[PDB]
């Protein structure tokens, strides 16, 4: 049972620059002191990435501003989030996000992650509902509150869970019937922007889902310190978490491989003529 959190449909999203982000290891082979050219669905350098702010707005403005819209999935998406206290917890992928078609549910409680692809009738605004208490000063159990019905399940997988301080990055890609996740976790300290630096994502898992993926919606966990059974959707706060979504595109890259096998630099071969001449000169 889910009670609609917000009446406002949308707010005008503002975009930031993804400076040299979202580079993932193309293959599982080791290379040292090697400049390597590889073609894949990479995220274009200096692109436009939508900036989402799920934070509590000041009391003068309307009481609710947190946003979790159903966003398109276009040949893979790039996802980042700068947060503390694990506000973001899971994502939902699927075509219609309703009962007739299958969809992928990937939700991660701090101790564990559940990855189920099953027909799901979804709530408009799905959220994991945590509660907190004042006398004990401890944080308590949660309520899932993400789907009304689950039927015809075909794959279950459970594994170890995968200012601002934490910067988590994920790249999702569906190719040839497999769903592949690339991840990287990096402590940072710039509060409101993507860092100016290079980080390489490592292959976490590839799954044999075999489902059509057209749209995805992020899952945020919300906290309220009082619970009554007959009244909900009143008193939820989003804390302070921001997530960023970019879109992948078929592009050619040239990668600098370090002595110890790390990826330290890469070049977009279509940014400008200078980048193209660097890509061809290698």
């Amino acid at each position, epitope marked *: 049972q889910c009670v609609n959190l917000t009446t406002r449909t949308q707010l005008p999203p503002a975009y930031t620059n993804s400076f040299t982000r979202g580079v993932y290891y193309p293959d599982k082979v080791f290379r040292s002191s090697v400049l390597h050219s590889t073609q894949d669905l990479f995220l274009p350098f200096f692109s436009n990435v939508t900036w989402f702010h799920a934070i509590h707005v000041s*009391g003068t403005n309307g009481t609710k501003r947190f946003d979790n819209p159903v966003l398109p999935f276009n040949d893979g998406v790039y996802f980042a989030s700068t947060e503390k206290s694990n506000i973001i917890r899971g994502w939902i992928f699927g075509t219609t996000l309703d009962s007739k078609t299958q969809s992928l549910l990937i939700v991660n409680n701090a101790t564990n992650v559940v990855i189920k692809v099953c027909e799901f009738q979804f709530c408009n605004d799905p959220f994991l509902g945590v*509660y907190y208490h*004042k*006398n004990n000063k401890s944080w308590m159990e949660s309520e899932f509150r993400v789907y009304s019905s689950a039927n015809n399940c075909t794959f279950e997988y459970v594994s170890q869970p995968f200012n601002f301080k934490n910067l988590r990055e994920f790249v999702f890609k569906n190719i040839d019937g497999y769903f592949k996740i690339y991840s990287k976790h990096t402590p940072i300290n710039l509060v409101r922007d993507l860092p100016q630096g290079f980080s390489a994502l490592e292959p976490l898992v590839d799954l044999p889902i075999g489902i059509n993926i057209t749209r995805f919606q992020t899952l945020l966990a919300l906290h309220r310190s*009082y619970l*009554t059974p*007959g009244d909900s959707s*009143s008193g939820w706060t989003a804390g302070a978490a921001a997530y960023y979504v970019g879109y992948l595109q078929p592009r050619t890259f040239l990668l600098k491989y370090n002595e110890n096998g790390t990826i330290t630099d890469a070049v977009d071969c279509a940014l400008d003529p200078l980048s193209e001449t660097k890509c061809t000169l290698k």
Partner: antibody
Amino acid sequence: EVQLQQSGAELVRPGALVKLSCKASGFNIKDYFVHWVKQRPVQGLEWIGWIDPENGNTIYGPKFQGKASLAADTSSNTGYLQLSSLTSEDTAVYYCARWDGYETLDYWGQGTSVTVS
Amino acid sequence: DIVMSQSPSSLAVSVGEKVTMSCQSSQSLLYSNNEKNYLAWYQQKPGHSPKLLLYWASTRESGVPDRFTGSGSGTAFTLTISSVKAEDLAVYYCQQYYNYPYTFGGGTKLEI
């Protein structure tokens, strides 16, 4: 033991606001929630709502939603209730209560009784 | 909103007699997620501020041991005394904690 200190009996004119004070010892109001209560022998006792000192906001009941306001300040261990203007319905006994999260009301003061000429 | 009814209105029994009071609700009190019944019971004397008796049917709290024993259902709720005691002149109420407002029952009185 927890005990509460409450406004004494009041005799007032209609057509004007009224203020109440509910006091606590042994804890900070931030630690809990605060309910308010008005009681009538005939027509029974009524439930007003809860105010959160930590939130800075308050969720009221619907019967009392009109003609009611709640305020709190942590500097003193005191919570306050006020009404827009005194009607015959408001000419009643009043109580304040403390509500634990995920729980019931646990503390009730001596009370306050409003009689009107 | 939830509405509460109480019975008996008033009953007179000798000290040591067994007495039972029952209050009935028009909606369910069970909450599936916790499987917990959000109901409490109160006892009050004239001119004494109402004080909570232990909720969730676990009525046992500090005081004289097992003063009053209670039983509840999804829609029905009863309180029992195995032997009426002379000191415990009491008036009782039934309240619910499922949705606003927390209902107050019609009241129950016990006379000796």
